[model samples]
Target: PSYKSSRVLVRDRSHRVAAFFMRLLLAGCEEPDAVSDDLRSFALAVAAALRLRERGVFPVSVPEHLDLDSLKAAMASAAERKVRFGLTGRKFVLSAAGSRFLITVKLPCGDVGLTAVPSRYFWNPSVGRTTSNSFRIEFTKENRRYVGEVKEIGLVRQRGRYYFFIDYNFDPEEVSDETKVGRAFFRAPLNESRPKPKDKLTVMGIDLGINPAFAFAVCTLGECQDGIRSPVAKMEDVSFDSTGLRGGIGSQKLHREMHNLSDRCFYGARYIRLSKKLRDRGALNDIEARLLEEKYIPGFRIVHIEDADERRRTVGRTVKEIKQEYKRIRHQFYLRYHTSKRDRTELISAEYFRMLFLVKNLRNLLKSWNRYHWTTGDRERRGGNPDELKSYVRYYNNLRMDTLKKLTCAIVRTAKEHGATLVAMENIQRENSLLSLWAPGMVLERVEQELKNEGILAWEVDPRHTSQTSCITDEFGYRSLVAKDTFYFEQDRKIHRIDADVNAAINIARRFLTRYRSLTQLWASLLDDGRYLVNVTRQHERAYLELQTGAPAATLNPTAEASYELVGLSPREPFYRHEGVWLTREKHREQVHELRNQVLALGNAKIPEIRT
Candidate 1:
């Protein structure tokens, strides 16, 4: 047998009828008291029609004084035949109307027959069959109305606020059930596809900082690697400076304005003694005060102008004194005023109001730039002009990080579309020699973590001697010194010393790449060992070595490799040799000489030891 279906008849006529009754009760009117039950129901039905019209859900407007006969005719043309009904608790049911559908409602309320009242219509036809079985309803105090929907409803009450919750299931396996059962609302889900590998493209290395925010380099592997087809041949550096925005001038200005306005209203009125002659003047003053308060008063008020005055005084001070004063005053003021009642409105305006608008504009600019890059046929061949690049940088500094985030999203999206597996970045560490005192190394670590969480493999390549000094030159070519007083070499040209740290870094990077290549080859090999999988044998060995030594694979040199091989014969011998080398007389002498030279150089140098 087919499933038995039953319709639930709701006790309430419609939301419009309840609203009209509420209005009548609040207004203390006798008209509703005099109206018959049937007329009251019809009036509510007409009000529902009017509400729907106001919402732009329906094209026609309802007349104010709608009679029962006219309401029924309008309902016949407009009302939905089938409607869902909700009971007091979790129970709900659906009902359909026939020619005498009105009679079903008349059994309970004898004051009026349902046949004499008009029924309301459902505006939306796409409401699901499951929703038709059960209706969801909510009362909105702001709108002074009740809204109804058909779905599985959950209610949460927190503090004094009530929230209606609905779950949206997005898994492909459950999509059909969710949609059919009204458990999910249909919308486009974020695309989640693993990126495919792309041909070698120019590497864009970005260094994030605090004051400047970002410093980026766009270069190709051909400049470093040999055989690959370099998609990006030319390179450029992009910088964004946000130092002006740090002190929160925009926020302070808004706060000052609000405080001034608020004070005018809050303390403007003074109590006056009552008298017959003064009564007229007092009434006029009261009206005038109210008008002025509404017009001139702000919602926020502030006290204590001392700090603001001090800041104004410090604006023209020297950089050293300014930095010292700023650091001292920032925490003091932030802790005291950030949560104060007077500063609450300022905080909101600064963090949310101004920042949101700035972020939105910045995001739009970045989105446009991203679109331009994607739609352009040959972004590298027809490289962006300096003016265009400057525009992007300008927007980023003056705007917000959200702009960069949007651009990054677009880049990731494009990369996924093109099947790119890994995103490469320059290893930013103290060893790299590109240091920013203002922005510590933690920022890069956080960015890397964020990228990893987004399913992108962030590969860090050692960028040894990539800037300030050329990585292409050998040690001899870089370090060879000519006698400065000798006439053999050009007068203008002086010998440049090869930075030992840079050379060491390059050698380490080369070693790392070699190991990486070997690991890749091993993974591609078919031969397997009983102890470990053939594909992961090299990886396992590298991981083991790293764990034992607490050193990266890239840092290992030929000497270290040979020593490690020898240590396999007797592990204790290697440890003894390492300690012995550190304690050697020659090593101690070299360290002493290096320390003395460093101290002497430091004494002669004019550079500040510490900078803000």
Candidate 2:
């Protein structure tokens, strides 16, 4: 399951493989669409059958026409629920530049073999390296060539092109050897010490959202001997202009650099996609066409508008015909698709490939865009440029990934600073609308990997009401007049200011405690529990004692309830801890009033309720 995988275009040898299977189905019928549809149905049925068999039901019969290898591969595909069939490449000629694989397809006529098929070596972008060194190659005397064993290869078809997806396996010894050689780097592992039994474990909660992008808060897991939890770390937000960039680099400088490159990639791809649309619509004027020609297709131009006179002369020629002619001209200027059987190699235009790869890269940047919240139809409904994606291959790899690395670096550094053993983050699922523009999954994975490097644990807590819930008390419900930038307790008349993102972060951190302990149990204890004062004299005296001298007082000898004189009017008052500040109901109100005034003075624009 833990293996490296990358795909190589195998269009050159695809026909031979397809034809071999097509002949098995029926002789002299080589329609790929029919072959594709039939194989798809067989694979789907096989999957259902496999699932039924696993549940102790043999529901179907095997086809006699298909061979044993095809059956086994289909079974494998069914088990994985992925459209891939295993292949044993006869030999692999390995090279860092590229590789050649020899494969065979069994046909009724004869055993057809494809030799020295060109395939690019697997290079993984996530790890920022190629798996060439992981493969073991040996010099072969049979043909004076170097041969490497192909551990596994999967056949796949995407966008009507066949691909060979190779999976590489690596041993610990091979990894260690790479570290010794120039293949991998060496770094000292940190956090090598284990904690004592009494040592407190710190937890850092992080929220990744729209406004600030990142919000974090640190807190100790449990309470101390005094029934007081460790003081909460002040919440912080990391933004595009945050001062937490690697080194002493100015946030503005980094932001400018990132912004410039981001714009270049975005505008570059946008222009290309726009040019295609304009061409398709026959709306590109001479100026726009000239610009497109110079920018994208350098030294290339639409030599002639061959249908201009005919289009003008013909009365039957409609706008559709004119658009088609313009599209034809556009294709001529860029790359042309050749459907001739003599030169069947180029089925799709190069322009299509360019758009495909660029759009894919763009999709990688704003992953959730046009996925869930914003669909293509939704964008079109808005009536602007419907294409929201904007990424060029050149800048995407260079700046986008580096920006993510810097972000994760800051997150790890913050976690390290807080001495956190576990960093809790929102379990960002693809369905969430909060993660609209950015690739939250990629950011989370990047942070997790960085934490792994530092020997810190990572956890994903429920993100349900982290923003709506208050960190100070169990104040839950609608956040009235709250913006992404600021929030307040619902009950607070003065609208005491608090950070919405940081409050969410604090809630995210506390949710970690609730995972192991029951919510009722958590409420019963002083670990983020609500305050209540009962008419208990003994409990009242305990609060009084703690208030007098920063520690609780207990009588050495057992005595009856002496007097309510020491604790004045405490029969109604309940002890409560809000944000680590313990106070009675009266003092709590006083503190609330004070925070309200501070919020008003800060010009938060909260309308204070007028008491009649």
Candidate 3:
């Protein structure tokens, strides 16, 4: 019951076409402000108003040729949610031009008053820039014609850009057919049966961290009964970084500098000023200077006269008087500049100052966000108000989430490859903040969404002990950080080395496996010796004994008296082969002891050890 969504950026640079189409779709719907009432009252009011009309005041508008019923569906959705909704298109026409695709969205449109928006599409890396074309080719070639049903098609705006979103159901047979999309290498097991709620679940464990952002390992419940076997060869660790990571702390420091630059003045001048010579030379015309200065330092220059009194006051406050105010202010600052003998006292053009700022500008631009952010990227520089820091953060968050979406897709794709029935991740506990990195929770959200899209089940487990526990043994194993990305643990006089995230993922899955199998405790995948059976056949006996004795089971059963005599067989005996003949058993048991040691060592070392 889930469908896939593909995002395509409209290649219309001018944006006039997208803008007009959006205007018609969103014509009457005014975005509501935050409601003051509490949820209890709001919910009642919302329910009471269930019998509402098409919610907006603006008359319903759509291209004359487009389907009114489809437009109404979008309008009804907006009404139900009390929010602006994208216009839905029921169908799309694709025209493949070699590697490029020309997508004709049959949504409402205008400007030319045409029925469809004929636009070129560009795919970002997340959506498969090169691989998407093959799918388009496959879908196109299958029908002989290039038209397909769109379950839900809409446009969403990000900053100044508009991206077309196409949501459509997929066929498993077509998805797994390599012959159709030969060039597009999809590893997902689209033909495999999804996980059922029943037992014997194949669980995929995942761990999220900062360095190697994502780590995952898969194992089934039935296999887990053996004891902590090493993770399978399919385990993976991803190093894809958050956006802007390459820039380092440079951008953050530059942002700090830009923030301070606006506040600093050599004199008692409250504003950055253009010098006298530049003003006299007409470096910028009156209107140009007015707008530039206003933008450079808001509230310092009044670019508009709204009132009669303000117009009367501005009549005598000519550009000359404005120039003098800046001249006098800079002159005061210039006195200090001259005395310092660093930056000269000579008047510089506005253009020259803006250019000099850039020499330091790249330094500012080079810096990315810090792990803990304390300041905003300047409000003016990015073209927003002083309170636009939220907007700034929101923008980059969108970009970061886009990268995360692709990462989630990769995770889910692999999940399908391994035929993972359920995905288990640590139920994270972290405080949310405006500038929070969101490296963990964001991935959980995206991966869950992706899993649902792929029809895979997801589970979250307690995070405690996941990272600190070992995946090689059932005995209360404690892991210590041995390296940046590896952990070390000791058991039976042997050192166990494992990837930290890999270990955590394995533990997470093991926890779920134990719970799923109704096990009382952890057990090694090897060397069971009836210890692992304590939670299976033994636990069932204990359960029946507790019921038989009307008294409390705890008082009757004490762990100190338990015995391991009836346990299963010990490890295989040591023997040697010579000239393809079985050698006779020797009385010198030390050789047998040494051979047994080698077997145990090989089991421990070969399975869990990850060198570095």
Candidate 4:
């Protein structure tokens, strides 16, 4: 059911709105252990107040509990986001902003101050991770603000820049689930209003391509009159600096380090083996076996110590109670919990280091192989095998990420400049393949995200024949066919052309809402036998609810496949043909505040009696 159909109350219904949580920021929580009783109270009060507000009632309970000024601030802040009950009514999800205090709690829950502490952690490559930073909160006597010292956890002392929390909220009572608190952290924060169809109906359709990046056209949402135009600027490949990620260190340097780590792993394993062998060789009892580990004190150092993770440090003791944290080394050999946790941390650290060494070695190896395959004339080593993902993992990712960045930016730029209210693409859910492995869906998502953030709408439609459908049509009403790489359109009753790919792109938007203000177009209908039948009558001057379903054999002609552009006349035609898209498939639907004079009904237009 749609949100209108939902029985449960959802405040702050606008999809453009989101909450800001401090925990999602660069600096970690100020105090990981402390729970603010008052903050808990504040969140609950806001939840209760918000529920009442949605019911068209002012929060009678709040002003009595709070002073005039305090109550006003709380109400204003709480109303900024929302609280919604789940389907079962057993749970709830709320939008939270760290800067905005719900009701902050006291013990028994009222409210108090909290502080943010800078958090740091390592990313063991064997353990794929990001965020390079995190934060915690502390209850302070004065105010709950973020002020913390950044410390090095081996790498740089701080993380690279990033956009923080977009929507985050929780049950303040427990204050225990750190995972839930961080889940709402969004990497990219683009905020803008959604587009309205009420605009003059400017829209653009884009066809994604690897070489061309994106082919696009601009036109009215209705029918084209001035002939469709490709407004996007052409470009060669947008290039980034070649410095590129060549592993953590240089290739050969990183490889040597991996070899050193492998040696360390071998030594550590050997030490464990030697001790077992000592007992086996001497037929010693358990006591002797225990004594054997004592025999390799120096061996553990020689084994894991060389080429281990570099952890440079300075000991400061004025904060005398500060205990040095044991590193979390996620290596394989240290599987069991050791008697000494610190010692375990060291080994784990060694393993974590070993893990990265191997990972780096893998990337660097691929990089070198790719370089060799391209540079060398060796017949056997040409371009490397496409099957192994590891061979071009980094290269593939870099090219995709960089290319989409350029493409999306250019597309949005052109659309926004032309005042196009909508951007469209053919939804093609895809999987890996030899010919075209890149996911246009992923790139289109980012593009749509930016567009929505800029108030320009982005959407996708079933691409079935959008690729084959031409931007130009003969007077006979058939969509003109163009060659794969050759395109021809009419200019002053003369022929004009360009790349065939752009032809498809132009038609994407043009034919997508392929309806005149006085016409609604239908392509085909589903038969009860599950076959889709074309309406040979072609072209359209009306709209449809849906094509009728019937048994295939009687109404079907196998040799009679023809292009069908059926338009059934109805009020639902335009809206049924209308929709929106955003970064994700979930939602991004918005309200149209004011209707433009355009978008009128095609009430009089009929099926033209199916002249065919």
Question: In TM-score terms, which candidate is top?
Answer: 3
Candidate 3 residue-wise lDDT, 184-262, digit = tens: 1111222222332333345677775534445677665335333246432222222211111110111233334333332
User: Clashing pairs in model 3?
Assistant: 226-525, 227-524, 227-525, 228-524, 228-525, 250-367, 251-367, 251-368, 358-361
Q: Is candidate 1 or candidate 3 better by lDDT?
A: 3
Best by lDDT: 2
- Candidate 2, number of clashes: 1
lDDT of every model, 2 decimals = 0.30, 0.43, 0.41, 0.33
Q: Arrange candidates by TM-score, highest first: which order?
A: 3, 2, 4, 1
Give TM-scores for every candidate, taking all chains together and pairing residue i with residue i. Answer: 0.25, 0.37, 0.41, 0.31
| Ten-residue region with minimum lDDT total, candidate 4 | 238-247
Model 4, residue 367: distance off in Å is 7.9
lDDT of 3 at 512: 50
The lowest-lDDT stretch of 10 consecutive residues in candidate 1 is: 181-190
The residue-level lDDT of candidate 1 at 170 comes to 15
| Model 4 alpha-carbon drift over 4 Å, by segment | 1-199, 221-225, 228-396, 430-440, 474-484, 488-498, 515-554, 558-612
- Listed per model in order, the count of residue pairs whose N, CA or C atoms clash below 3 Å is 5, 1, 9, 41
Model 2 spans > 4 angstroms off? 13-71, 74-121, 124-150, 168-203, 217-421, 427-456, 461-507, 510-598, 602-612
